[PDB]
């Protein structure tokens, strides 16, 4: 359901291209009219993933980097919602890959946590900083690790994301993988540089927060 108080934002959300075209034909300014959250038709089109509508808006020359009241840009919205083709179009029209919202998150953070593989590759090929830290000092790798997104970790590693960045609690992605008992993800991380010796702010290493026999599994890998 769409919460926008604007008719035009609702048209964009429900994918009514023709009706939207008529509205905007009747009043050009509607293309960039902001609702109660400073979202325009573009934000809402990205959310619902209506590619043709985004394409139309873009060719009208609407701004593509304006943030809503929560700091979310169209790219943030498209990446989170998993809108492959829209992300591609946005990046093609100069969307800022490293834009942050009020939480300090880039579009990559959401791609990574939500397991948007194609979008992640797009963002990273587009120059996204893999080590970008949000206001919790967490990286995309933290998200991928916690959720147990193996493929996403491989992607991030190919683009040279660090495995040992500590968040605000002092946890590395390995701490998170171990706590959620994400076994294969934890092995991968270790096999590619993640330290089993780094302590969080409770002075625990990733082995000490590991559940099941995961601690010993990782200890073996490193220490035999």
């Amino acid at each position, epitope marked *: 359901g769409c919460v926008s108080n604007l008719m035009v934002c609702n048209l964009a959300y429900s994918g009514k291209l023709e009706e939207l075209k008529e509205s905007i034909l009747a009043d050009k300014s509607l293309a960039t009219r902001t609702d109660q959250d400073s979202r325009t038709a573009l934000h809402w089109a990205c959310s619902a993933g209506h590619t043709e509508i985004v394409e139309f808006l873009l060719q009208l020359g609407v701004p593509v980097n304006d943030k809503d009241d929560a700091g979310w840009s169209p790219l943030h919205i498209a990446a989170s919602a998993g809108r492959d083709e829209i992300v591609k179009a946005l990046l093609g029209k100069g969307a800022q890959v490293n834009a942050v919202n009020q939480n300090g998150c880039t579009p990559l953070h959401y791609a990574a946590s939500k397991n948007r593989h194609e979008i992640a590759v797009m963002l990273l*090929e587009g*120059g996204a900083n893999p080590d970008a830290k949000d206001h919790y000092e967490a990286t995309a790798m933290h998200r991928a690790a916690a959720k147990g997104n193996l*493929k996403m970790i491989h992607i991030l*590693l*190919y*683009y040279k994301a660090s495995t040992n960045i500590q968040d605000t609690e002092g946890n590395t992605p390995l701490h998170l993988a171990c706590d959620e008992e994400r076994v*294969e993800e934890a092995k991968l991380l270790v096999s590619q540089g993640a330290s089993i010796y780094i302590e969080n702010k409770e002075e625990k290493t990733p082995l000490q927060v590991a559940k099941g026999g995961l601690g010993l599994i990782l200890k073996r890998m490193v220490e035999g």
Partner: single-chain antibody, 228 residues
Framework: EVQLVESGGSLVKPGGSLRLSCAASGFTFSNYSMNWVRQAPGKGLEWISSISGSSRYIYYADFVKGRFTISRDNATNSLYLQMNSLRAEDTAVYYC??????????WGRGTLVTVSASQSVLTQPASVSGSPGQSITISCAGTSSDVGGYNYVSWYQQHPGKAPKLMIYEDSKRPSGVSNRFSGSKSGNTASLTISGLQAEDEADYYCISYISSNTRLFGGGTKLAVL
């Protein structure tokens, strides 16, 4: 339609130095990681080098050791490979390949390099006798360093003189446009491709590739599938 055309493949005396080129079209070249993969006669698919869209990230297989250098020009949609000091073990068909991680989705017809003048790390069966309509399985075996639960095996199909096709990647996932008669799985240090209801068009060569990291792609020696 996506097209990759390799050129520059010739015969050259050992010690010589070649330069391969690839003309790309049918997609946004600049947005894609590109690769060079070579295949010696009878041998498997050996990944050589990859380069990111922006040229920021470049990787080489261990054997390269400075002898090869990949480059690209997004402006003119072309990929290059500078090969120095050509040994005889370099004799192969060199393919230009689009893809990242384990997903090598587009290959060119390849260009042949001949140097005029020790098995594969992963182990496949040489031959597989199939009977139309039945069901067969090709195995890909390695050590615990080669095939694991936290990395991927991919399967590639190849007909005589044709661009290799990606059948399976990520152990078990298959690209759109590929028949569901093809499936893959893995147990311990061994991956298995399976085909059900064999065709005669299914008769071909099959190769496995274990993706370990950005600079490590292990390969099997190939498996000839004969459809009776």
């Amino acid at each position: 339609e996506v097209q990759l055309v390799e050129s520059g493949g010739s015969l050259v005396k050992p010690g010589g130095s070649l330069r391969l080129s690839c003309a790309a079209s049918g997609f946004t070249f600049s947005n894609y990681s590109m690769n060079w993969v070579r295949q010696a006669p009878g041998k498997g698919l050996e990944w050589i080098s990859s380069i990111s869209g922006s040229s920021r990230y470049i990787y080489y297989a261990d054997f390269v050791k400075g002898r090869f250098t990949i480059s690209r020009d997004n402006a003119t949609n072309s990929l290059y490979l500078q090969m120095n000091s050509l040994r005889a073990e370099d004799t192969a068909v060199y393919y230009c390949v689009r893809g990242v991680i384990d997903k090598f989705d587009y290959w060119g017809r390849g260009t042949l390099v001949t140097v005029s003048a020790s098995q594969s790390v992963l182990t496949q069966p040489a031959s597989v006798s199939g009977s139309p309509g039945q069901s067969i399985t090709i195995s890909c075996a390695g050590t615990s360093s080669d095939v694991g639960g936290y990395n991927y095996v991919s399967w590639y199909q190849q007909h005589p003189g044709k661009a290799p096709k990606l059948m399976i990647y990520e152990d078990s996932k298959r690209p759109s446009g590929v028949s569901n008669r093809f499936s893959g799985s893995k147990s311990g240090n061994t991956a298995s491709l399976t085909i059900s209801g064999l065709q005669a068009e299914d008769e071909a060569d099959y190769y496995c590739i274990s993706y370990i990291s950005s600079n490590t792609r292990l390969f099997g020696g190939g498996t000839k599938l004969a459809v009776l």
